[PDB]
Amino acid sequence: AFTFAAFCYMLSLVLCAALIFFAIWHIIAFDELRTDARERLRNIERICFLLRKLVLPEYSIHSLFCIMFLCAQEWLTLGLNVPLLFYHFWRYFHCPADTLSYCQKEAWCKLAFYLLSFFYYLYCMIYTLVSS
Amino acid sequence: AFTFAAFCYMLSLVLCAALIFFAIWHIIAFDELRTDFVHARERLRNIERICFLLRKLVLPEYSIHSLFCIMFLCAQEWLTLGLNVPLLFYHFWRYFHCNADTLSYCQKEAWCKLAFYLLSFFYYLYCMIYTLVS
Amino acid sequence: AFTFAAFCYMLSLVLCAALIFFAIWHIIAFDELRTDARERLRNIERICFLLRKLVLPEYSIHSLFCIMFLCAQEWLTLGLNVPLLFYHFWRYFHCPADTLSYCQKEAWCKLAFYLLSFFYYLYCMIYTLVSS
Amino acid sequence: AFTFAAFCYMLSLVLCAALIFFAIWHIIAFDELRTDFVHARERLRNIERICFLLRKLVLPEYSIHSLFCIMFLCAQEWLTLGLNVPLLFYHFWRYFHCNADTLSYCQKEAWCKLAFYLLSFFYYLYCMIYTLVS
Amino acid sequence: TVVVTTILESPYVMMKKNHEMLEGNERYEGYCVDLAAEIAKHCGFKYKLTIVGDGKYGARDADTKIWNGMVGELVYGKADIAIAPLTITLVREEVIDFSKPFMSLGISIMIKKPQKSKPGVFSFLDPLAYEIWMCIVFAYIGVSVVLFLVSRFSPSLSGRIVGGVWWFFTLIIISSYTANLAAFLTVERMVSPIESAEDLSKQTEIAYGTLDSGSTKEFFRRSKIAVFDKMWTYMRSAEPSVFVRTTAEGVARVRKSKGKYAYLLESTMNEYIEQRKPCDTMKVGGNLDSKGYGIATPKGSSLGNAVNLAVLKLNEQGLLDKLKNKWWYDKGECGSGTSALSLSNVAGVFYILVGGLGLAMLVALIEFCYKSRAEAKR
Amino acid sequence: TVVVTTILESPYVMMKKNHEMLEGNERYEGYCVDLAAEIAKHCGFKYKLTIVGDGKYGARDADTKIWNGMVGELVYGKADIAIAPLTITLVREEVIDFSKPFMSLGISIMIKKPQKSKPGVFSFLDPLAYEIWMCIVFAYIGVSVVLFLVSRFSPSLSGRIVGGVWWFFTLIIISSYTANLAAFLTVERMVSPIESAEDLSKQTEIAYGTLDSGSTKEFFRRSKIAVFDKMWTYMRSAEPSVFVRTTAEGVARVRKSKGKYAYLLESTMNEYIEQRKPCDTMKVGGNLDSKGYGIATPKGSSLGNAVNLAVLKLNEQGLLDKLKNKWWYDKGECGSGTSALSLSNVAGVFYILVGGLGLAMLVALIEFCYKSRAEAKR
Amino acid sequence: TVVVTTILESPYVMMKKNHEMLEGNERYEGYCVDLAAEIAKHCGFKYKLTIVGDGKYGARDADTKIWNGMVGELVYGKADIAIAPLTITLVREEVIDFSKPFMSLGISIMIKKPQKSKPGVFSFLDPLAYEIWMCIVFAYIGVSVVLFLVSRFSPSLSGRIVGGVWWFFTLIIISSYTANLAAFLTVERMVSPIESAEDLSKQTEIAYGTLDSGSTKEFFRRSKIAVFDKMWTYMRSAEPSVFVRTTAEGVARVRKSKGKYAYLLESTMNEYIEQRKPCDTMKVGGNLDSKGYGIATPKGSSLGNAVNLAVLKLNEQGLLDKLKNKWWYDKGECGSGTSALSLSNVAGVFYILVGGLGLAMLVALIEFCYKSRAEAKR
Amino acid sequence: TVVVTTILESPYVMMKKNHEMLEGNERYEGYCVDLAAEIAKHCGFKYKLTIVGDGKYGARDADTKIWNGMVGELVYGKADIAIAPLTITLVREEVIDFSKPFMSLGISIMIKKPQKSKPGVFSFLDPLAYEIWMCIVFAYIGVSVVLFLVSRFSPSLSGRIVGGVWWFFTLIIISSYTANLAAFLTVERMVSPIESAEDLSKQTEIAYGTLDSGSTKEFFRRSKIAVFDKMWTYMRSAEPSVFVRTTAEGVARVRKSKGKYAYLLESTMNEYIEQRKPCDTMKVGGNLDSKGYGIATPKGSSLGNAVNLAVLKLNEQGLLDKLKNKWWYDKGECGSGTSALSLSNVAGVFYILVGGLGLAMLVALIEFCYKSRAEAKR
């Protein structure tokens, strides 16, 4: 009924519920910066501060997901996460930080991926619950 | 003879005590501001201090009243909860409803709020009493 | 063997062990101030700060002593504390704060009283321990 | 096969790891200061920073070594404790015993301290090992 | 044959279930039945188990000195032997000859076994002693004081060792309290303060009475001892009337007065009820007096010595105890004789919590009305 | 061829899936069938099977003095030999020549297969009523409120005392909860269900019953044993009736009952049942008595002498154990049918945890919006 | 008456403080003395007391066929009447006329008065060895050290994980300690010492013994009872010897033993002992058998007829109970001789608490000095 | 008279303690003694209890076909009856006539009762399940993450509800763990994975052997069943030699191989040892095979029918079970069949603590060497 994997799925679900709004805020900040003197400079810098700041959470939570799904024997789900891990590794290797088109495209793709992994985890958990 | 309601009522009246004190302090604050209504600088500093305190004494009202409401909701007491609802409705009305004019009615508003919270304190006391013995 | 009063006596003993050094520091500050420009003014003010500051502990600990000895049924000991309580009350009523002779005299008398109450509590506790 | 001593030894070697790191960092700090021995202002700032760090890395030595000593004292181990005593005696001697002269011997002192703490780490390891199985 | 007269009293004289479908000695059963059987085996004769008419044991009239009961039967020749739970006395011996007692007994104390008491408003303190509680309180306030001193009397190495020792202390206290409470809840050992008659004598909360007409009443009236005289004085002046008219009345009164009454009766019947349903009774203390049931036979008789010897033969053989265990314990129905936690067990906790919280609120409010008032006015 | 009278009792003898389309020995099937087959292979004869008329084994009537069943069939020429679960007895050995037991057995006990391991999702609240859980929650939030107030309007002493009283409160609360839970677990742990008959003689919660009438109760009667004597005494004073009609009645009433009833029957039938649907029964208590089933035959016969040898040969070759395995387990509709805490006992805890976490995430998001938007944009 | 033969057995009959300066009935004193006094006052005669030669009551030899003791003294004219604890028996009733029992009694049990409530000062560490307490202490200080280091040289993640692992560790530690303590307390709580004989038959830790030879073991022998049969079987297979020599031997060996031995003797002597120094014994188990002591007299006499009435009169007037009280309790060298945790179980905790507090005060004082002096003055 | 031949085997044939001081049937005692006594009572004859010479039960030579043992005595007329624990077989029946079995039995499994296992290095996790532990770990790290988010993703009302729910969670977890551990420590229920022979068949850790020369060996050699054939294959290829030369040898081997061996023998002797000292044995499972001890008598005899009927008479009377309970359980010595906490029970705790602490130290050190290095170099 529980199997201890429904817990990992619930955790990842509650966490992606925030990741999705985070990516939404990313897309909204991009649409707002699309305007591209001191007023605009500050309006851009205050937001770039938060943006450049909010990097670590993504890596942390993705590591959490991978670890939990490795220890919960949910192998079929880990393979659907490792590509984003390699992507983040290549980003840390070389990340553009010309710089807006690719940024918005990666943001949109990552948002779609998060919102689909939401449903994936939800269905997997629903099936794991009633597998009795 | 506890019924989980005596504890709730005594907690509610304990909070209503602080509520009564805040209301009386507001009475006295508005009285002193009426009296008043570098001496000008001193008066400006004093009114700034009192208004800062008042603005800091805003969340307590909402918090304690919502607590009374939700507590009596989980306690299934409909004999006094319905009496606390109107004050919550007025509190939510103040948002899209609300310095020589604001105090004109705020005086009477605070007076009636004092009487109301005091009445509710006494009611909570009597209810805790005739609920603890039965 | 214990009777729960030995505990109050141990507590009061450990607390008077610090009160006695506090009064010693009082007498030493008085002997140092006995000198009576900016250097001396500061050397006096920095010490008067700590002195005027360290008032509350005395009242607090004496209230603690009285309360514990009231709840421990050690009546014969409370009567030997109530006079200092009335003295502290009269002090709070009117305290000189011309101002040095009486201060040093009260300090010396209070120090003697504390150091004798030390031995009183110690002996009372020793007797309460082996009253079996 | 625990005897309360394996835990003590493994804790001691865990601390000796940080000890080894501090010693190696001191080696490298003194090496860079030897090399060095607004460019003058930058050098002054760097030497101030390194000396501040060193002064902040003083209490750890005393604390961890006194801990080793007292631990092996309560563990009743006289086969290695007597070996840690001399270092405590030297530490207490430094008070009434102890910038181009101080480092002259401090270099060799830190080198020998590194070798000593490393030797003690290995000894603690082997002792934990042949105490955990018996 | 012989006239074996007796009376209907269980578990001595009982009618089998198929009594209407039977006619003869096979009708009756019980203790005295097997007793008379063994007696006949020892003496070897025939008998017919008759019954008394007046439904009484035996006594004489005060004015007509006529013997009513089995005594009247044997003295007036209406019978020949009385194998019944008859009590031995001086008067009865003056007219007839008994045998050595076969069942010794005495007055006892029947009560309802202790049921779960009131939740004990301040029960959470029961696992420990008031002294330990006050010691804990004083330790808390003293450690608070000390911590207050290491902040003003000095800027730590003081809040470290103090923290560790307080951690140790609170740890051990938590563990002790939890363990003692678990032990209290796991077994639930029930006891009462009534282990003798002296207890009932000293106390006056729970009452105690006896059948308003019988031998126990006369005994308590007599026996001018410092204890029983006190109890007689009590019961002679006690409202409502503790006395009763029948045994079952007193038993039912005890059943409806769980912690307000205690009956007195022969220890035999007490042990009997203690094994019967609803199994809500128990005998306490020991036999206050000493008496014995013995066979009866007219003054001038022939079986006197025979039965006097057979009774001792049996008592030494280990047979009367057998019949007793049979008709009291083996036949016994009460051969046998967890829950969640209710709020009434911890009400004091919340009472003290609310008290302290209101006190803290009042303290904060007066502190505010003083500090801000002084800062504004000055 | 040679006549062979038997009886239709499962699984010893049963009918093929289609008995209407069969004629001959192939009609029936069962343990006794292969037994007789091996017997014929040993003594080398052709036989013809038959069933008894009265559908019984054999017994005497107090007035007819005429054996019935297969016993009478043998004594009265109606049968050449009997091969069936014919209990060996003294009365029957006096008229026929039993062979040595081909199957030893005895009385047994039956109970409900315990699998009641379905815990309530929110069971962890069972130690104490919701009446206390809600108090806990509201006291927590109220104390947080008061702490916030004190730290807000007076920026301590009140904080110190509220912290101390909260420490006391949570101490007592966790102690009470832990102790009640420990009591529950311990009690549930030290419950030895059954291992023998005495496990029931010393208790009365679980009743035990037998058939309305048979060799079972007869064994219980005339039983010197104190344990069986007490069990017979109990069952005789049983209300409602422990004794019941045909086996199926007792079986069903114990099936429905969780653990309040037990049925005493033969060990072999109990084994057969335990290996049949719905696989909700078992047998634990070792066989109390000790008897056996044997092949009967007319007294003045030659087969018995030639049949005991075959029986012993098969008992030594293990063929009998093999046949029993085949017809009890291999043909079993049930193949073969802890201490720690499972997650189910705590699921609700993680549920409410994730609930609080999601609620906190929502609160944080709405606050971040209401702040950043309202400040920078608005 | 009139000669009166008795025996010097305490407390029934004893000598005054100075028996060398006495001549007459005033020499002796005891229960039986006042008993004979009342008997004389009733029947109105003058009597002269005497002691038996053999120092025994009475018994036959398989060869002499001659009663010894006071029995022989009576049968052989050496005594006019006997007044002593003369056990009533069948064999003796055949040669003399016993009166009704002036004192009923039976076999009893004796044990050591339990007062072992002296707990070790540092007992609270008993649940687990110092080998773990030292580990706890040193791990605490080491973790504090590592936290200080991490927060010093890197002003977090490491702090987070050390806090988490410390949380796990302290969780498991306090849990283990509390669980072991609860187990100890529970076990110590559910120990019903004794309430009857069977409480011993079903156990073997506490041995029970009797006298080397007497009516006690004889009753145990020839005993159908399963309980007493098992007890006799055990004692017969006892190694070392449960049976012992004269009472004093058993009494002393059970006095020294804490709770490993029990002595079966008469209830009356057990009562006398329980009311004598060093008041370290008691009697709990109800009387197993039931017998009584009576006044003997030559068969063809007139006093027995005139003596049974006096005995019954005194038993009804309670005079016998009064004398027993006088000579067992009023003359008793012992006047009359829980669940929570006492402080003694926790003293060490408060000791170390005060130690840490004083050490902290000292540390704070020395630091305040070393700071203020060194900075302002130095 | 009769030649009652038998053999010395307990508790059937035993020599009384005073065997040297006696000469006659009074010498021997045991089960078969009372059995023959009852048989003589039923048949009414005289007998002399002789003994076998070869000290064997019975068999024949392979080449000389001479009967050795009691069989040789009865067949060759050297005796007349053999009341001994003789096993029934096909060969013996072919020469003589047995009686209906009086004691049914079969091979069993003797082992040493489970002693306290190793402290269980990772035992502190046993009260709960690995799944719950991992759930707790994930909850801790997830709550840490959340708290980390309400600090940067927002400046509370988030750390309040989260704090309360985490307090609730950790509270309940503490309580559950403590309660389960206390229940584990209080009762200490011991069990083993060996409840049948199938268990020994599947596993191979603990060995099992039989007397290298006997009937059990031949049986295991035979019985081509999927189970016993596996065990025979095992024991035929198993080092060291599990087989033994005598029973006591195997018993001692089991005693010195607490958890490494298990013996097979007749269930009777197994139950016997289970009641003898040092009481460190126990029988498991049930009788694998089925056999019975029965009287013997020459082929052509006269007592055959008499004893064949008397055996059933007794078995129905409830007497053989009596004698068995007498010579096995009543005579039984093991009628009966807390501690502090050692470090070995919690070693894993400190192992994990030190591991995590070293990991934290390494993490802090790399963080320092990175942060300070970057801040200096840049």
Side-chain angles (χ1 to χ4, degrees), chain G residues 66-77 79-112 114-138:
Chain G
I66 286 158
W67 302 86
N68 53 5
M70 288 168 286
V71 177
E73 290 186 340
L74 293 152
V75 177
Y76 309 143
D80 296 329
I81 190 172
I83 295 170
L86 175 46
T87 291
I88 281 170
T89 70
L90 170 53
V91 310
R92 298 175 228 200
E93 185 66 0
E94 291 169 349
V95 311
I96 42 171
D97 294 336
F98 274 119
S99 68
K100 292 301 190 313
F102 62 85
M103 165 180 290
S104 306
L105 71 172
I107 295 161
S108 61
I109 64 180
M110 205 173 70
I111 56 163
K112 185 73 162 61
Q115 67 271 347
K116 316 318 205 78
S117 45
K118 171 47 58 176
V121 180
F122 286 54
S123 68
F124 53 81
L125 312 164
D126 296 339
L128 70 168
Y130 304 81
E131 200 79 355
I132 299 162
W133 289 106
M134 303 317 264
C135 277
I136 277 167
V137 163
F138 290 133

Side-chain angles (χ1 to χ4, degrees), chain B residues 1-37 40 46-134:
Chain B
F2 205 85
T3 306
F4 165 90
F7 160 79
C8 286
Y9 289 170
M10 60 178 46
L11 181 154
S12 287
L13 69 86
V14 160
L15 302 187
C16 275
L19 189 40
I20 291 281
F21 233 80
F22 291 1
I24 282 160
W25 186 77
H26 289 166
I27 292 284
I28 294 145
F30 294 172
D31 191 3
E32 184 176 1
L33 292 197
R34 166 55 157 81
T35 55
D36 182 66
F37 206 96
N46 300 8
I47 186 168
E48 175 58 20
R49 177 263 303 178
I50 194 69
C51 188
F52 169 63
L53 265 50
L54 264 73
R55 271 174 300 188
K56 256 172 69 175
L57 275 74
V58 181
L59 200 76
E61 297 286 327
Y62 296 163
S63 190
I64 68 184
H65 200 72
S66 307
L67 203 79
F68 298 170
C69 164
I70 187 174
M71 184 177 296
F72 310 150
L73 186 58
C74 294
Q76 302 164 3
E77 283 283 5
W78 296 78
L79 291 169
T80 79
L81 174 144
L83 315 179
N84 301 150
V85 158
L87 193 150
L88 173 82
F89 283 4
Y90 186 98
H91 276 197
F92 282 21
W93 183 275
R94 218 154 63 195
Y95 269 31
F96 71 105
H97 160 50
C98 287
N99 294 9
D101 186 322
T102 62
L103 76 163
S104 185
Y105 190 89
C106 199
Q107 266 191 304
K108 313 181 80 186
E109 176 271 348
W111 253 115
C112 71
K113 176 169 282 299
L114 170 70
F116 176 98
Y117 284 142
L118 196 148
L119 189 144
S120 200
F121 163 96
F122 269 106
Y123 206 99
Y124 294 158
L125 186 158
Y126 180 45
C127 292
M128 187 260 276
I129 285 303
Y130 72 74
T131 289
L132 194 77
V133 299
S134 54

Side-chain angles (χ1 to χ4, degrees), chain D residues 1-37 40 46-134:
Chain D
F2 205 85
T3 306
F4 165 90
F7 160 79
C8 286
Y9 289 170
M10 60 178 46
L11 181 154
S12 287
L13 69 86
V14 160
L15 302 187
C16 275
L19 189 40
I20 291 281
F21 233 80
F22 291 1
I24 282 160
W25 186 77
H26 289 166
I27 292 284
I28 294 145
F30 294 172
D31 191 3
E32 184 176 1
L33 292 197
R34 166 55 157 81
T35 56
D36 182 66
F37 206 96
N46 300 8
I47 186 168
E48 175 58 20
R49 177 263 303 178
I50 194 69
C51 188
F52 169 63
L53 265 50
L54 264 73
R55 271 174 300 188
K56 256 172 70 175
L57 275 74
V58 181
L59 200 76
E61 297 286 327
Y62 296 163
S63 190
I64 68 184
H65 200 72
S66 307
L67 203 79
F68 298 170
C69 164
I70 187 174
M71 184 177 296
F72 310 150
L73 186 58
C74 294
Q76 302 164 3
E77 283 283 4
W78 296 78
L79 291 169
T80 79
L81 174 144
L83 315 179
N84 301 150
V85 158
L87 193 150
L88 173 82
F89 283 4
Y90 186 98
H91 276 197
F92 282 21
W93 183 274
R94 218 154 63 195
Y95 269 31
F96 70 105
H97 160 50
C98 287
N99 294 9
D101 186 322
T102 62
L103 76 163
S104 185
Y105 190 89
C106 199
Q107 266 191 304
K108 313 181 80 186
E109 176 271 348
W111 253 115
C112 71
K113 176 169 282 299
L114 170 70
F116 176 98
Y117 284 142
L118 196 148
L119 189 144
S120 200
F121 163 96
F122 269 107
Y123 206 99
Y124 294 158
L125 186 158
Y126 180 45
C127 292
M128 187 260 276
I129 285 303
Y130 72 74
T131 289
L132 194 77
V133 299
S134 54

Side-chain angles (χ1 to χ4, degrees), chain F residues 89-90 98 100 133 140 170 174 177-178 182 186 189 224-225 308-309 312 316 339-341 349-350 353 360 365, chain H residues 89-90 93 99-100 126-127 132 135 153 162 164 167-169 171 175 178-179 183-184 187 189 316 321-322:
Chain F
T89 70
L90 172 51
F98 274 119
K100 291 301 192 311
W133 288 111
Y140 180 104
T170 184
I174 74 178
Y177 175 72
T178 295
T186 300
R189 186 171 174 78
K224 181 270 288 172
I225 308 309
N308 189 359
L309 299 174
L312 297 187
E316 288 170 6
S339 60
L341 279 173
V349 173
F350 310 112
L353 174 67
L365 296 150
Chain H
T89 62
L90 171 52
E93 205 87 29
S99 89
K100 297 286 173 289
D126 292 355
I132 286 172
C135 195
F153 197 51
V162 169
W167 175 81
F168 205 69
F169 168 90
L171 187 154
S175 295
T178 52
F184 274 46
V187 306
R189 278 204 294 93
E316 299 169 353
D321 66 337
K322 177 174 192 174

Side-chain angles (χ1 to χ4, degrees), chain G residues 206-224:
Chain G
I206 310 96
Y208 41 74
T210 66
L211 203 70
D212 55 6
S213 60
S215 62
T216 300
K217 52 160 55 46
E218 287 196 357
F219 158 84
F220 279 112
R221 283 200 279 89
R222 58 182 311 282
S223 188
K224 178 271 294 178

Side-chain angles (χ1 to χ4, degrees), chain F residues 77 79-112 114-146 148-198 200-221 223-244 246-257 259 261-314 316-318:
Chain F
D80 296 329
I81 190 172
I83 295 170
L86 174 47
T87 291
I88 281 170
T89 70
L90 172 51
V91 310
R92 298 175 228 199
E93 185 67 0
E94 291 169 349
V95 311
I96 42 172
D97 294 337
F98 274 119
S99 68
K100 291 301 192 311
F102 62 84
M103 165 180 290
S104 305
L105 71 172
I107 294 161
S108 58
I109 67 181
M110 205 173 68
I111 57 163
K112 186 74 162 60
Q115 67 271 348
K116 316 318 204 78
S117 46
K118 171 47 58 177
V121 180
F122 285 52
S123 68
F124 54 81
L125 310 165
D126 297 339
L128 72 165
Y130 304 82
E131 201 78 355
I132 300 163
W133 288 111
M134 302 313 263
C135 284
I136 276 166
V137 162
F138 289 132
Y140 180 104
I141 70 191
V143 168
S144 74
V145 157
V146 173
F148 170 65
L149 260 63
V150 166
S151 287
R152 188 189 181 85
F153 66 70
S154 68
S156 48
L157 175 45
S158 300
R160 276 167 202 290
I161 72 180
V162 301
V165 70
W166 169 257
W167 172 83
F168 189 83
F169 166 93
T170 184
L171 161 73
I172 276 173
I173 286 292
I174 74 178
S175 313
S176 302
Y177 175 72
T178 295
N180 202 274
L181 186 58
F184 281 18
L185 269 296
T186 300
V187 170
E188 174 169 8
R189 186 171 174 78
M190 61 195 200
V191 290
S192 291
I194 58 171
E195 310 77 0
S196 60
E198 54 171 359
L200 299 174
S201 69
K202 301 176 290 199
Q203 78 90 46
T204 181
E205 205 289 328
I206 310 96
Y208 41 73
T210 64
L211 203 70
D212 55 7
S213 60
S215 60
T216 301
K217 51 161 56 45
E218 286 197 357
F219 157 83
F220 280 111
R221 285 200 278 88
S223 186
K224 181 270 288 172
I225 308 309
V227 190
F228 305 129
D229 181 13
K230 293 165 62 178
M231 296 153 66
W232 174 235
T233 284
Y234 163 92
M235 293 183 293
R236 189 164 69 270
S237 87
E239 308 189 8
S241 180
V242 292
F243 314 89
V244 303
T246 295
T247 291
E249 308 211 352
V251 168
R253 67 181 284 163
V254 67
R255 287 260 196 69
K256 68 190 195 188
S257 309
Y261 183 47
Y263 188 28
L264 301 173
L265 75 164
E266 205 68 39
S267 63
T268 290
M269 185 52 52
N270 199 339
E271 282 165 46
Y272 184 49
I273 294 310
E274 179 181 341
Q275 300 298 123
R276 280 279 172 288
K277 294 286 175 57
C279 319
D280 70 335
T281 43
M282 67 193 308
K283 173 185 83 81
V284 291
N287 304 332
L288 311 175
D289 62 354
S290 60
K291 71 194 70 156
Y293 299 162
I295 313 313
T297 178
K299 195 145 280 181
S301 165
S302 84
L303 315 190
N305 301 0
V307 158
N308 189 359
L309 299 174
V311 170
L312 297 187
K313 200 162 163 53
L314 301 161
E316 288 170 6
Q317 291 180 335

Side-chain angles (χ1 to χ4, degrees), chain H residues 92-235 237-244 246-257 259 261-265 267-314 316-337 340-369:
Chain H
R92 297 181 176 155
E93 205 87 29
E94 283 170 324
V95 294
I96 57 155
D97 291 329
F98 286 84
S99 89
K100 297 286 173 289
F102 60 94
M103 165 172 287
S104 295
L105 74 170
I107 300 150
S108 69
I109 293 159
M110 175 200 272
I111 66 188
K112 182 188 287 175
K113 42 187 75 182
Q115 202 59 242
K116 294 300 304 314
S117 166
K118 204 160 168 47
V121 178
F122 289 72
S123 45
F124 49 87
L125 310 174
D126 292 355
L128 312 181
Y130 299 81
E131 60 197 355
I132 286 172
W133 292 113
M134 302 312 256
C135 195
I136 276 162
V137 168
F138 293 168
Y140 185 86
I141 66 192
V143 168
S144 87
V145 161
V146 161
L147 271 301
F148 170 72
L149 296 178
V150 301
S151 198
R152 296 163 71 265
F153 197 51
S154 163
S156 182
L157 205 72
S158 291
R160 290 189 166 284
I161 65 184
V162 169
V165 70
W166 176 261
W167 175 81
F168 205 69
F169 168 90
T170 188
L171 187 154
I172 281 164
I173 294 305
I174 290 150
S175 295
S176 306
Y177 186 95
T178 52
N180 222 18
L181 192 57
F184 274 46
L185 296 180
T186 302
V187 306
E188 297 185 0
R189 278 204 294 93
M190 288 166 142
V191 298
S192 52
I194 303 91
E195 298 164 341
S196 66
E198 190 192 352
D199 304 342
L200 296 198
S201 70
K202 302 295 180 288
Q203 80 93 40
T204 75
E205 289 72 356
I206 57 179
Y208 41 85
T210 74
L211 159 58
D212 58 0
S213 63
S215 308
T216 316
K217 186 165 188 160
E218 206 285 332
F219 161 64
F220 268 111
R221 189 190 304 284
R222 307 291 298 105
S223 194
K224 54 182 69 53
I225 299 169
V227 190
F228 305 154
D229 209 353
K230 189 207 304 189
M231 307 161 82
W232 183 233
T233 302
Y234 168 103
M235 293 187 296
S237 80
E239 301 296 82
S241 57
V242 300
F243 297 74
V244 311
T246 54
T247 294
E249 281 171 22
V251 194
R253 178 170 166 165
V254 169
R255 289 203 177 91
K256 90 191 171 45
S257 62
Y261 197 40
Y263 193 41
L264 315 187
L265 73 165
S267 56
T268 52
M269 187 63 67
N270 196 331
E271 300 164 11
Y272 197 47
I273 309 320
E274 172 166 349
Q275 296 295 348
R276 286 291 94 84
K277 280 181 302 317
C279 308
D280 67 337
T281 59
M282 91 190 306
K283 183 263 287 178
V284 297
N287 291 260
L288 318 185
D289 71 330
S290 63
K291 310 182 302 197
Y293 296 149
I295 312 315
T297 305
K299 188 63 60 51
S301 61
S302 61
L303 292 156
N305 295 319
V307 300
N308 197 323
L309 303 149
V311 169
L312 313 173
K313 186 183 194 60
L314 301 158
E316 299 169 353
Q317 275 179 12
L319 173 144
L320 308 171
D321 66 337
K322 177 174 192 174
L323 293 165
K324 204 185 188 172
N325 305 335
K326 177 179 184 177
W327 293 104
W328 268 271
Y329 298 127
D330 301 317
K331 192 74 70 167
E333 305 163 339
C334 321
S336 198
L341 184 48
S342 55
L343 195 144
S344 45
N345 309 93
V346 305
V349 172
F350 299 87
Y351 294 138
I352 295 301
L353 173 72
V354 160
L357 197 58
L359 193 144
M361 182 60 83
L362 179 70
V363 161
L365 292 201
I366 62 170
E367 155 166 20
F368 172 87
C369 85

Side-chain angles (χ1 to χ4, degrees), chain F residues 4 30-40 42-45 47 49 81 83 102 295 303 306-314 317-324 326-327:
Chain F
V4 172
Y31 187 101
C32 291
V33 193
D34 307 333
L35 180 62
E38 298 296 333
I39 292 285
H42 166 273
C43 296
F45 58 79
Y47 64 91
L49 295 158
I81 190 172
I83 295 170
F102 62 84
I295 313 313
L303 315 190
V307 158
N308 189 359
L309 299 174
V311 170
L312 297 187
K313 200 162 163 53
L314 301 161
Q317 291 180 335
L319 183 144
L320 313 169
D321 292 331
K322 187 262 183 185
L323 278 172
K324 169 147 199 178
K326 153 173 173 207
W327 284 97

